[PDB]
Design an enzyme around this catalytic site. Structure first.
Site, short mmCIF file in Angstrom:
data_model
loop_
_atom_site.label_atom_id
_atom_site.label_comp_id
_atom_site.label_asym_id
_atom_site.label_seq_id
_atom_site.Cartn_x
_atom_site.Cartn_y
_atom_site.Cartn_z
N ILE A 15 -3.96 7.25 17.14
CA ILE A 15 -4.10 8.02 15.65
C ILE A 15 -4.68 6.60 15.26
O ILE A 15 -5.33 7.08 14.24
CB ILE A 15 -2.63 8.30 15.13
CG1 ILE A 15 -1.97 9.70 16.10
CG2 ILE A 15 -2.63 9.14 14.22
CD1 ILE A 15 -3.45 10.87 16.22
N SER A 19 1.70 -1.23 11.07
CA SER A 19 1.85 -3.03 10.96
C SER A 19 2.54 -3.16 12.08
O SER A 19 3.73 -2.58 13.10
CB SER A 19 3.18 -3.29 10.00
OG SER A 19 2.73 -2.89 9.53
N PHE A 20 2.37 -4.50 12.85
CA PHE A 20 2.50 -4.98 14.19
C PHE A 20 2.27 -4.03 15.60
O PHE A 20 3.43 -4.05 16.16
CB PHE A 20 4.12 -5.88 13.91
CG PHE A 20 3.98 -6.17 12.77
CD1 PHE A 20 5.15 -6.64 12.13
CD2 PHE A 20 2.95 -7.28 13.02
CE1 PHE A 20 5.33 -7.70 11.43
CE2 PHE A 20 2.83 -7.85 12.01
CZ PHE A 20 4.17 -7.94 11.11
N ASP A 128 5.17 -2.78 1.81
CA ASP A 128 4.01 -2.47 2.20
C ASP A 128 3.92 -0.36 2.14
O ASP A 128 3.43 0.24 2.68
CB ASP A 128 4.00 -2.32 3.94
CG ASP A 128 2.70 -2.43 4.10
OD1 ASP A 128 1.51 -2.25 3.59
OD2 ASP A 128 2.10 -1.60 5.70
C1 LIG Z 1 5.75 5.21 14.34
N1 LIG Z 1 5.70 5.93 13.12
S1 LIG Z 1 5.56 4.39 12.10
O1 LIG Z 1 5.55 3.51 12.62
O2 LIG Z 1 6.14 4.80 11.15
C2 LIG Z 1 3.60 4.74 11.46
C3 LIG Z 1 2.68 3.94 11.55
C4 LIG Z 1 1.76 4.15 11.38
C5 LIG Z 1 1.33 5.41 10.73
N2 LIG Z 1 -0.07 5.98 10.56
C6 LIG Z 1 -0.88 5.62 11.57
C7 LIG Z 1 -2.20 5.66 11.21
O3 LIG Z 1 -3.17 4.87 10.19
C8 LIG Z 1 -1.69 5.20 8.99
C9 LIG Z 1 -0.64 4.86 9.33
C10 LIG Z 1 1.98 6.85 11.48
N3 LIG Z 1 1.28 7.25 11.09
C11 LIG Z 1 1.87 9.22 11.62
N4 LIG Z 1 2.81 9.26 11.63
C12 LIG Z 1 3.35 10.14 11.09
N5 LIG Z 1 2.88 11.71 11.34
C13 LIG Z 1 1.67 11.42 11.28
N6 LIG Z 1 0.64 12.56 10.92
C14 LIG Z 1 -0.45 11.67 9.82
C15 LIG Z 1 -0.05 10.44 10.43
CL1 LIG Z 1 -1.42 9.35 10.25
C16 LIG Z 1 1.54 10.17 10.98
C17 LIG Z 1 3.22 6.71 11.61
#
Ligand SMILES: CNS(=O)(=O)c1ccc(N2CCOCC2)c(Nc2ncnc3[nH]cc(Cl)c23)c1
EC number: 2.7.11.1
Length: 256
Positions: A15, A19-20, A128
């Protein structure tokens, strides 16, 4: 315990980056998001970051916090959250240029505040918050994500001047400033300083107080009260910024 046994998590489409780590869409009792570190043997520092991030996440149970579901350590350090059926707030506003109704923009701001209020009550500083970490589920629900940088008490456009200067620096108030920038994005449809093409200069100037978001760019049907709250959140002096219960109260006061 919240550990998921090896082999249970299916990992699909990459996707993007968090972070990290690297974020993928996955399967584990339905759709999930998975962030993993790819280094074969993680360093004590990395292994720490992971243990810290899990620690923060498991303290959160709230409709507006992206739902932590579990973690894995083999074959690699992985964090599992719910999958949010939709795009990041950033994608909506700046990539896709989705035009939302004003009342929906406000509602988004309300929920983000709602989520932040909860973290702060739990003594969590996100560190963040930015529209890249705010995801819109099924176009309705707001979920704040990516706790790689959070604690209990490179994206410069959301950093408070004190954070840029690094002279003290993170606090509830720096979280509030980042919120202010998200408000800006909502109300203007734009990232700040979009007429400046040089990252170092933006850094130098915001840090020194020479530059700040231009509020005259808010859509003309953006309420006066909202424009004002934005200005308060963005105060260069951190102590002058409102608290989230305050931010929440004044947004809710726009039941008009
Ligand atoms: C592992 N979970 S987390 O560490 O909280 C996490 C970290 C970074 C991201 N994004 C990746 C893409 O770049 C932006 C940040 C996401 N993204 C999403 N998570 C769940 N549903 C989602 N629908 C659409 C997106 Cl997008 C998305 C989740």
């Amino acid at each position: 315990d919240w550990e998921i046994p090896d082999g249970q998590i299916t990992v699909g489409q990459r996707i993007g980056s968090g972070s990290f780590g690297t974020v993928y869409k996955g399967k584990w009792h339905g759709d999930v998001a998975v962030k993993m570190l790819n280094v074969t043997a993680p360093t004590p520092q990395q292994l720490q970051a992971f243990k810290n991030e899990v620690g923060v996440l498991r303290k959160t149970r709230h409709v507006n916090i992206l739902l932590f579901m579990g973690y894995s350590t083999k074959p690699q350090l992985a964090i599992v959250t719910q999958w949010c059926e939709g795009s990041s707030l950033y994608h909506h506003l700046h990539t896709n240029e989705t035009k939302f109704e004003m009342t929906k923009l406000i509602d988004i701001a309300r929920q983000t505040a709602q989520g932040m209020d909860y973290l702060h009550a739990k003594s969590i500083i996100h560190r963040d918050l930015k529209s890249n970490n705010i995801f819109l589920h099924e176009d309705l629900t707001v979920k704040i994500g990516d706790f790689g940088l959070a604690t209990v008490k490179g994206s410069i456009l959301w950093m408070a001047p004190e954070v840029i200067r690094m002279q003290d620096p993170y606090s509830f108030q720096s979280d509030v400033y980042a919120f202010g920038i998200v408000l800006y994005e909502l109300m203007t449809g734009q990232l700040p300083y979009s007429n400046i093409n040089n990252r170092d200069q933006i850094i130098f100037m915001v840090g020194r107080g020479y530059l700040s978001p231009d509020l005259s760019k808010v859509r003309s049907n953006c309420p006066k009260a909202m424009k004002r709250l934005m200005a308060e959140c963005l105060k260069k002096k951190r102590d002058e910024r409102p608290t989230f219960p305050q931010i929440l109260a004044s947004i809710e006061t726009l039941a008009r």
